[PDB]
């Protein structure tokens, strides 16, 4: 594919006329990669107009798929394009990337067939430190800083030392501090993926929030409420809202079949419910402790040979639909052991 270097960015709140692709229906996140393939000659014609212009095309955030109604949308840039003449007809492959959020003013459809939209660029307001407006001239040098529990305790007391001057305390501003908030998302991100925050996760607060917006299952409505955000602090807060509202535990392959819930999560191990658990070969799997779990079949027999939990036999528990290795069904051998039967599902299969 033919690569591009140029980066185009329109002015804030300035009204711009940008065409909308009809094939694109899904809501776009700023900076998100989109693999498109357009067959229609008039659709390939719009792309041919963009490359010579500025490669910036509009993607509507459709509130209702029926009436095609969309109050918001995101601008997408064509960084790569390829024109392959396959079996006789002209086909184009377009790689899109989000640039700026926008408010839809008016939807006007041309006599040619394609549709255009009156676009107003949403201001990406980036607020700095909350302490910046109240920090004393003497404590200014203490702001720079050279076991994870100890760090955050010292981080709060030092950066937010001027909290006594305001009506609100130290810990209150932590709920609004980007660095503190980013760590809360990182915590639950580790509860699903083994990837370290050093390389897989970005450092910039605005960019980091946008990546999360896609992974976590968010229906159009949540995605719109997620885009109405024009500031980093409003984005991470909303990501925490999703983490504290949709606890629905499913299978990573099924995505629809329910395994268990947050209510059934019980603390047996002293680390909590889930910690690192290695079987005979050398696999590091984080095993969840739950009372009851639905949609799980029992294959073979429960063997007591190398059991993580003390004196429990592990039956090979699998899903009823995809047949993925979800975890185990630990049963008590002795009559004086409780919980008698509880599920030992690994993180890798848990959603």
């Amino acid at each position: 594919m033919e690569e591009f270097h140029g980066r185009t960015l329109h002015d804030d709140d300035s009204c711009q006329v940008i065409p909308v692709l009809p094939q694109v229906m899904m809501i776009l996140i700023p900076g998100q990669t989109l693999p498109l393939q357009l067959f229609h000659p008039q659709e390939v014609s719009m792309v041919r107009n963009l490359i010579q212009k500025d490669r910036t095309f509009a993607v509507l955030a459709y509130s209702n798929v029926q009436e095609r109604e969309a109050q918001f949308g995101t601008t997408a840039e064509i960084y790569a394009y390829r024109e392959e003449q396959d079996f006789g007809i002209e086909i184009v492959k377009v790689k899109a990337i989000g640039r700026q959020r926008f408010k839809v003013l008016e939807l006007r459809t041309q006599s040619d067939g394609i549709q255009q939209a009156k676009v107003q660029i949403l201001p990406e307001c980036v607020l700095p430190s909350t302490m910046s407006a109240v920090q004393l001239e003497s404590l200014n040098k203490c702001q720079i800083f050279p076991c994870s529990y100890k760090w955050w305790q010292k981080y709060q007391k030092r950066k937010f030392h001027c909290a006594n001057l305001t009506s609100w305390p130290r810990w209150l501003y932590s709920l609004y501090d980007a660095e503190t908030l980013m760590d809360r998302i990182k915590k639950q991100l580790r509860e699903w993926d083994e990837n370290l925050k050093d390389d897989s996760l970005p450092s910039n607060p605005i960019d980091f929030s946008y990546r999360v917006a896609a992974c976590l299952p968010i229906d159009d409505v949540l995605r719109i409420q997620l885009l109405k955000i024009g500031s980093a602090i409003q984005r991470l807060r909303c990501e925490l809202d999703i983490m504290n509202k949709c606890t629905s535990l499913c299978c990573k392959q099924c995505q629809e079949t329910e395994i268990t819930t947050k209510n059934e999560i019980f603390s047996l191990s002293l680390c909590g419910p889930m910690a690192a658990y290695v079987n005979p070969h050398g696999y590091v799997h984080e095993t969840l402790t739950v009372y009851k779990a639905c949609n799980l079949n029992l294959i073979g027999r429960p063997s007591t040979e190398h059991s993580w939990f003390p004196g429990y036999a592990w039956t090979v528990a699998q899903c009823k639909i995809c047949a993925s290795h979800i975890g185990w069904k630990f049963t008590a051998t002795k009559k004086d052991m409780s919980p008698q039967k509880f599920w030992g599902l690994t993180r890798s299969a848990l959603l």
Binding site: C125, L127, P128, S129, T130, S132, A133, V134, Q135, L136, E137, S138, L139, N140, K141, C142, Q143, I144, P146, Y149, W152, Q153, N164, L165, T166, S167, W168, P169, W171, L172, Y173, S174, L175, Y176, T180, R184, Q225, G230, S231, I233, Q234, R237, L240, N244
Partner: protein
């Protein structure tokens, strides 16, 4: 559309800067005191201090330094505001008329560049040739000190080190050199760079990068014959000159990190030190070359922001949180040890976290009670018109909230004290505070190192004698937020409702909170109703005999039953986290820290809350108040005030649910709380009365006005700017305009009382120059606007 008047009733008292030199005369020693926007001039005397001239400036003072270049007999003062305005001033006195003049004026703000963590560092070369200002990370501004440089030309030189902790100018050098400590992935190093005016580029210094302490924060310039710079961190006081390096680690400075420093001797032998715990230390230099550095404790003073040495052991403590003290030091006389003696105590109201207008003795004239100071400097202040009399009540603990009960005749004050962790397993107070010094103590019902632990207490203080009668100690890991004193339901007794929240180091969001109820009768405090809720209780308000409490984001209302218990009625969920609550009649105001205003009204027919109008704009919010049914006063980021008006006569649903931002004004002060009423005795051309307390101690009043009064005052403002000379030649239209790091907007729907009232102070020809389209007819109108405060 809004039309409002904002006048400074009380000037800010918190000292931000204090330097000693020769401003008025070359022979007379002068002390300059900076109080946020106000400037004070004093002549150093053996008895104390003498006042000569006090001038108001149109900018938040951040940089203030005295220097003497060649040709000039007396020292010139350099002032840099928060609005980035460089100005050089000199004292002028002929017969009786005093007029401070500006030799050079100009702006030093750049269109590109992010503000640094340390902010602005103001340092001027000892030989008085150049001014060094670190405004942004990695960028260094150099402004020359010449007679030709009147417009103040500035150039930014690219520096390799982004994160700079503290920068100062070196002594005993031909070319100007800057010494600084930077942070990098390796640790912390001290580096020097030589400045050249010709090349306009940085060059190699007198010595290479040397390794220092991991917590090295302060850098002090050392004059001749010693030379070099002293670097003090948290544990030790290091010395550098090149090949020469001296290190001493005192255990007495380990208790609290030194934040401020001052030079005593003209050669560099004695140095005043001030930590976070208000302790006063002395840095002694032994002797061309240094023999050894000695650190000695003097005593206990106010939490110093900046120290200054005057004459004959008289030291002026510049405190932002506590009272400014003129303390005497006993360094001399080997017979008796080092002891500090306070001589004069300057009243400091800053900071103000909670305030109330309560009639105590007058029953007509409003008397304001403020929760001033922090930590050991935390004290109660009673303000009334005399001139304004201030009555101080020490607490020795951080005050949070205040409430009044006319039935029990006492004040309910929230307090937070610091208690260090014990080796065996417990806590012990640093010094006896109002809570431990109380007549009677009480504890709540329980459920289920070397670290400072914050413990909360509910204080009961008298309204005439001001004595700590009762103190209610709060549970472990519990933080108090809201406290209201009002009658609930059909109950005739007046209760104190507490909106506590459980804070844990591991729990970022508070998942636990209590709604404790207290009654005060026969000089005894008692627990009435305990209501545990899943979340934090930030703010509470009374709604027609019912208690409204906010749990995280949700807004809840409680009914007061005959069983003396709190009962849930209806829950109103919200997208944003509820933090600010204000009410009048039926209208309820909701606000967060991200400046997302939301108006709700309790519909009693359906038995719930209906969303009326909402305004979403991202900014750091701090304080809010309802002016009327449509107008509401709010305080946001970068020391500004805003007013948003709704329209009940809007033809479209989208218009009436939208709030129009009609109010824009830069106060130059940070407001944390708002309360109704007036300090004066109760035919006013001003509508309503809203008083406010700030971080620096500046107390003012916000009041609505009519359409005619606004235009009459607005046109007076543009004329007064022409006659009144601005201190530093900085525009009033630029200073009062809405300021933010991303945008600048003009002031609308606001009238500055500071410029209107100045018409009485200025002379008669300047009075006649404004009224000319009447001179004495306008005076009576200005005099009407002075009576209100």
């Amino acid at each position: 559309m809004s039309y409002n008047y904002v006048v400074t009733a009380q000037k800010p008292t918190a000292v931000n800067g204090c330097v000693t030199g020769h401003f008025t005369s070359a022979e007379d020693l002068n002390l300059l005191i900076a109080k946020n926007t106000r400037l004070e001039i004093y002549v150093v005397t053996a008895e104390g201090l003498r006042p000569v001239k006090e001038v108001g400036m149109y900018g938040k003072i951040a940089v203030m330094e005295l220097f003497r270049p060649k040709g000039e007999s007396k020292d010139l003062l350099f002032i840099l505001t928060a609005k980035y305005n460089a100005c050089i001033l000199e004292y002028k006195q002929s017969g009786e008329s005093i007029d401070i003049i500006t030799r050079a004026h100009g702006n030093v703000q750049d269109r590109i560049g992010r503000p640094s963590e340390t902010g602005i560092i103001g340092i001027i070369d000892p030989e008085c040739r150049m001014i060094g200002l670190r405004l942004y990370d990695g960028l260094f501004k150099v402004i020359p000190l010449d007679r030709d440089n009147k417009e103040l030309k500035a150039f930014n030189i690219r520096l390799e080190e982004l994160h700079v902790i503290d920068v100062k100018f070196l002594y005993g050098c031909q070319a100007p050199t800057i010494c600084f400590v930077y942070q990098d992935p390796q640790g912390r190093h001290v580096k020097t760079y030589e400045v050249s005016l010709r090349e306009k580029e940085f060059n190699k210094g007198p010595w290479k990068q040397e390794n220092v302490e991991a917590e090295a924060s302060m850098v002090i310039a050392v004059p001749e014959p010693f030379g070099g710079a002293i670097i003090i961190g948290q544990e030790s006081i290091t010395y550098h000159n090149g090949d020469k390096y001296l290190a001493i680690a005192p255990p007495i400075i380990k208790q609290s990190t030194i934040v401020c420093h001052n030079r005593v001797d003209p050669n560099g032998s004695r140095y005043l030190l001030g930590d976070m715990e208000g302790r006063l230390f002395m840095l002694l230099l032994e002797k061309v070359t240094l023999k050894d550095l000695r650190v000695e404790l003097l005593g206990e003073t106010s939490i110093a922001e900046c120290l200054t040495y005057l004459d004959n052991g008289v030291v002026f403590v510049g405190s932002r949180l506590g009272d400014s003290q003129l303390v005497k030091l006993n360094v001399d006389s080997n017979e008796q040890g080092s002891y500090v003696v306070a001589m004069e105590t300057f009243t400091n109201l800053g900071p103000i976290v909670d305030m109330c207008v309560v009639d105590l003795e007058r029953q007509g004239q409003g008397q304001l009670v403020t929760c001033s100071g922090a930590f050991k400097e935390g004290s109660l202040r009673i303000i009334r018109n005399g001139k304004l009399h201030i009555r101080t009540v020490p607490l020795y603990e951080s005050p949070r909230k205040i409430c009044y009960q006319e039935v029990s005749q006492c004040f309910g004050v929230l307090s937070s004290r610091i208690e260090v962790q014990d080796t065996s397993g417990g806590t012990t107070a640093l010094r006896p505070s109002a809570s431990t010094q109380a007549l009677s103590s009480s504890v709540s019902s329980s459920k289920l190192f070397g670290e400072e632990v914050e413990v909360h207490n509910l204080l009961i203080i008298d309204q005439h004698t001001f004595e700590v009668l009762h103190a209610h100690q709060f549970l472990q890991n519990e933080y108090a937020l809201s406290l209201v004193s009002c009658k609930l339901g059909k109950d005739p007794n007046t209760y104190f409702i507490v909106g506590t929240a459980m804070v844990y180091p591991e729990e970022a969001e508070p998942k636990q909170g209590r709604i404790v109820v207290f009654q005060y009768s026969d000089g005894k405090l008692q627990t009435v109703a305990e209501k545990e809720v899943k979340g934090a209780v930030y703010s509470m308000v009374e709604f027609n005999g019912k208690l409204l409490a906010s749990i995280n984001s949700t807004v809840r209302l409680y009914e007061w039953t005959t069983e003396k218990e709190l009962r849930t009625e209806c829950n109103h969920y919200n997208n944003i986290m509820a933090l600010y609550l204000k009410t009048k009649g039926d209208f309820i105001l909701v606000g967060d820290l991200m400046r997302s205003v939301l108006l709700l009204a309790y519909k009693p027919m359906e038995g719930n809350f209906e969303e009326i109008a909402r305004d979403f704009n991202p900014n750091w919010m701090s304080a809010v108040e309802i002016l009327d049914d449509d107008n509401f006063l709010g305080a946001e980021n970068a020391f500004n005030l805003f007013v948003c008006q709704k329209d009940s006569a809007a033809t479209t649903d989208e218009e009436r649910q939208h709030l129009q931002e009609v109010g824009l004004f830069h106060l130059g002060e940070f407001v944390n709380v708002f309360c109704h009423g007036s300090l004066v005795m109760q035919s006013t051309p001003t509508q309503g009365s809203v008083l406010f307390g700030t971080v620096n101690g500046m107390i003012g009043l916000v009041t609505s006005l009519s359409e005619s009064w606004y235009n009459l005052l607005l046109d007076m403002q543009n004329r007064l700017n022409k006659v009144i000379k601005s201190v530093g030649k900085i525009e009033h239209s630029f200073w009062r305009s809405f300021h933010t790091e991303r945008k600048t907007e003009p002031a609308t729907g606001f009238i500055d009382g500071d410029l209107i009232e100045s018409f009485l102070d200025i002379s008669r020809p300047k009075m006649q120059e404004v009224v000319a389209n009447t001179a004495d007819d306008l005076i009576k109108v200005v005099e009407e606007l002075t009576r209100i405060h």
